[PDB]
Design a binder for this molecule. Structure first.
Ligand code: HEM
Ligand SMILES: Cc1cc2nc3c(=O)[nH]c(=O)nc-3n(C[C@H](O)[C@H](O)[C@H](O)COP(=O)(O)O)c2cc1C
Ligand code: FES
Length: 753
């Protein structure tokens, strides 16, 4: 009864604190928006919907982000009024256009080079913490380390004197309950009193800072910015922010790190991998954020009528975005319940939000997670979770257990046998991990050589444990002898078969070295560094009819799509053309599966597939999926550019790599509309490199126009396309753009970033 579940929905309970993505799985799957009467909120649960809401803060205001779920009684008001409580807007809950202007004025101390200066402090505090308890054999990781490290760092970043932690903790709990919780009525007056005391304590801190405004920390810097921008950095802002940022600057980092260590210790195989290889830590942390992140729900309120998930919402409608649900959305993350530290798009999780309000401290929080995981993985690889109950403080937005008890045998501490482990340091990842940071080590279980220039590889985990599932069209990248010679190969095994992955690698007659290395070097039992899967050629599973066209080695993604069409029961034909009979691969398998829906054309025997004839017989609604040589794909796109009632999707294997030659190029201007930022791209930089340098997070893989991972959305201007992914019609729309290589025809571009 999905209508009953909506009626009863109530996040203030252990089940939603413990696993909010499971708690709303029914809605993510079947009811992507519902009204929750116990809250007076609309609840949304899918990744695409939540990302769009984040993109549009004019329509979807963050005004209710810090809003209490209580009354307030006149007694509560009166308690609050005694302290002059006037908490108003900070950054996270501020409306446009004021928000972006204040962010612009205040964001500089959050720059990479400043945040990297805190590394020594984080390392020293983590080392101190673990030294205290390393020999005990039992410890609560939260009260012994994970809470104090971000707390200490945060107050130092802020310039707040750190001398009364029991009072600060008391203050932080009350603020959090007040902002995100639902205290019962018999408890609200005590909460209100502590909130008032926190407000007045922040008044005192602020007044001491005003008289030392040249001292350190971000709050004194905001006071100095007030002198220059008094209408932007107000007294109301400064006082409200002081209270909110004392909590925000540590609590969520504590929670993320608590959740990460719990998830890692619950997956012994993965924990053992990290303990043998610290370079996995940036990718493992991102997937901990994706899989078990500290953000449950986040809020917005409509400022106009708007349709959402096919429902027309009135003005002022409250929306709860279940961010944890989005991070488990199978439409964006294949096999989302699989905890996969090789997951190549893990950093697309929404724990840091997206666009205008995107978390300013996120790379400091990442660094703290990484160094804490590192220290524990080096010194306590043999610890395990003790038996315990996990207790969660109820609130709608942030979730972690309050304690994390672990136990180990100190006589097995590896530093006793090898004390120089204490001198090792894994250099820290600033920002999300790059593609070459997200790598799985695989074993070549078998190698078949059906023809002189095709090798079929069967790839498994070295331990043969299960692999994540993928979806038709996905590819992996194999590092062909070095990390900077990575090549894409389409997965062509069964996407649900977790035992192994199959690829077929053609030896290229003019190899730049990649497929040549595979043909000269790969043998069963070898270990390969593999990235992905990533899917840039997804099958629309709701088409009425399919036409699948494979030219040569282009059969590899196409055959996974034809197998899927069969399983869905949709009408399809599979046409497979080769030059030499010896180049046929998988034909016996394909005949068994597809029967009389398979058509094979061997051109050395004089047989070819007349595409103009085959397309003019295609009926309206048909989706054509094709992979083959460049000339075959051009032909299909000329034929389809005059048949609007059929659609074409192509994947290019043989594009020409892009290469920036700055002598032939010009600077251009890019406006990031959602981030409220305008940057210049000089002649010697790609757009991708400039986005990274402004900490705009964009995923990339080949970085040379071939794989399409770096695509961004253009809303104004004319693109000078340099990639090999887009069709001509796509190029002419001036919407999609590969930022690793493409530039501008107009002087400026406007991006939806
Ligand atoms: C480590 C885990 C962290 C998480 C999960 C987290 C979460 C968030 C979220 C969800 C937002 C709102 C995003 C949006 O609406 O688009 C946010 C904003 C913000 N965060 Fe974080 N945060 C973390 C760490 C930090 C740290 C360590 C700091 C400060 C040192 C911090 C400072 C801020 C600020 C100032 C904003 C306001 C940005 C704005 O509205 O323009 N965050 N954070
Ligand atoms: C998305 C994508 C999928 C590809 N799939 C395959 C494949 O399944 N088999 C293959 O031989 N080449 C495939 N290629 C081409 C290879 O990635 C690679 O360019 C080719 O092996 C030539 O590399 P080389 O010049 O270094 O030898 C694919 C390319 C792309 C962009
Ligand atoms: S990263 Fe491969 S196309 Fe840009």
């Amino acid at each position: 009864p999905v209508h009953r579940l909506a009626e009863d929905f109530d996040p203030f309970q252990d089940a939603y604190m413990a696993d909010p993505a499971q708690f709303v799985r029914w809605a993510r799957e079947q009811v992507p928006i519902f009204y929750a009467p116990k809250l007076n909120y609309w609840v949304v649960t899918r990744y695409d919907t939540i990302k769009q809401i984040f993109r549009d803060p004019v329509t979807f205001s963050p005004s209710n982000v810090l809003q209490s779920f209580a009354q307030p009684s006149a007694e509560v008001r009166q308690v609050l009024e005694r302290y002059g409580y006037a908490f108003n807007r900070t950054l996270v809950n501020e409306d446009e256009p004021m928000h972006l202007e204040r962010r612009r004025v205040l964001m500089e101390p959050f720059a990479s080079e400043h945040l990297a200066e805190h590394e020594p402090m984080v390392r020293e505090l983590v080392r101190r913490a673990v030294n205290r308890f390393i020999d005990t054999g039992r410890a609560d990781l939260v009260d012994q380390m994970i809470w104090e490290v971000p707390f200490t760092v945060a107050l130092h970043f802020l310039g707040v004197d750190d001398d009364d932690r029991e009072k600060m903790r008391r203050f932080a709990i009350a603020h959090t309950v007040n902002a995100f919780g639902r205290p019962s009525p018999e408890e609200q007056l005590a909460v209100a009193e502590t909130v008032g005391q926190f407000w007045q304590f922040c008044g005192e801190v602020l007044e001491k800072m005003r008289r030392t405004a040249d001292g350190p920390g971000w709050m004194r810097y905001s006071i100095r910015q007030q002198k220059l921008y008094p209408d932007v950095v107000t007294d109301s802002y400064l006082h409200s922010m002081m209270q909110a940022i004392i909590v925000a600057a540590h609590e969520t980092t504590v929670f993320a790190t608590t959740n990460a260590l719990k998830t890692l210790l619950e997956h012994e195989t993965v924990w053992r991998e990290i303990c043998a290889d610290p370079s996995l830590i940036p990718a493992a942390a991102e997937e901990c954020l994706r899989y078990n992140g500290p953000v449950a729900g986040w809020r917005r309120r409509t400022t106009r009528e708007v349709e959402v998930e096919g429902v027309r919402l009135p003005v002022g409608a409250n929306i709860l975005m279940v961010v944890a649900s989005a991070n488990h959305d199978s439409a964006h993350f294949d096999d989302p319940e699989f905890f996969d530290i090789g997951r190549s798009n893990a950093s697309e999780h929404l724990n840091f939000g997206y666009g205008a309000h995107q978390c300013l401290g996120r790379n400091l929080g990442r660094m703290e997670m990484q160094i804490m995981i590192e220290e524990l993985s080096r010194r306590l690889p043999h610890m395990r979770l003790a038996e315990q109950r996990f207790d969660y403080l109820h609130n709608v937005s942030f979730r972690a257990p309050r304690h994390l008890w672990v136990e180990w045998d100190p006589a097995q501490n590896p530093e006793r046998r090898d004390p120089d482990i204490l001198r090792l340091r894994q250099p820290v990842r600033i920002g999300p991990p790059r593609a070459k940071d997200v790598v799985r080590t695989m074993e070549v279980a078998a190698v078949e050589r059906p023809s002189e220039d095709i090798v079929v590889l069967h790839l498994t985990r070295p331990d043969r444990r299960p692999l994540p599932r993928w979806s038709p069209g996905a590819h992996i990248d194999i590092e062909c002898g070095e990390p900077d010679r990575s090549r894409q190969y389409s997965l062509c095994s069964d996407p649900e078969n977790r035992d192994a992955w199959r690829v077929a690698v053609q030896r290229d007659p003019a190899s730049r070295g990649g497929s040549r290395w595979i043909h000269e070097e790969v043998r069963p039992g070898m270990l390969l560094r593999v990235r992905g899967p990533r899917n840039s050629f997804r099958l629309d599973e709701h088409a009425p009819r399919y036409l699948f066209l494979a030219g040569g080695i282009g059969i590899t993604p196409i055959m996974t799509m034809a197998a899927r069409a069969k399983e869905l029961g949709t009408d399809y034909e599979l046409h497979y053309s080769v030059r030499s009979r010896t180049s046929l691969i998988f034909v016996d398998e394909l005949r068994q599966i597809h029967g009389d829906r398979l058509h094979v054309y061997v051109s050395e025997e004089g047989v070819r597939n007349d595409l103009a004839a085959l397309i003019r017989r295609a009926s309206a609604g048909t989706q054509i999926y094709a992979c083959g040589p460049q000339r075959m794909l051009d032909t299909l796109e000329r034929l389809i550019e005059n048949r609007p009632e059929v659609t074409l999707r192509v994947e290019h294997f043989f594009g020409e790599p892009s290469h920036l030659d700055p002598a032939k190029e010009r600077p251009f201007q890019v406006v990031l509309r959602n981030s409220g930022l305008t940057v210049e791209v000089p002649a010697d930089k790609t757009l991708l490199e400039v986005l990274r340098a402004y900490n705009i997070e964009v995923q990339s893989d080949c970085e040379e126009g071939l794989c399409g991972t770096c695509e961004v959305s253009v809303v104004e201007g004319e693109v000078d396309h340099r990639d090999s992914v887009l069709t001509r019609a796509e190029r002419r729309e001036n919407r999609r753009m590969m930022c690793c290589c493409s530039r501008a025809k107009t002087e400026r571009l406007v991006l939806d970033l």
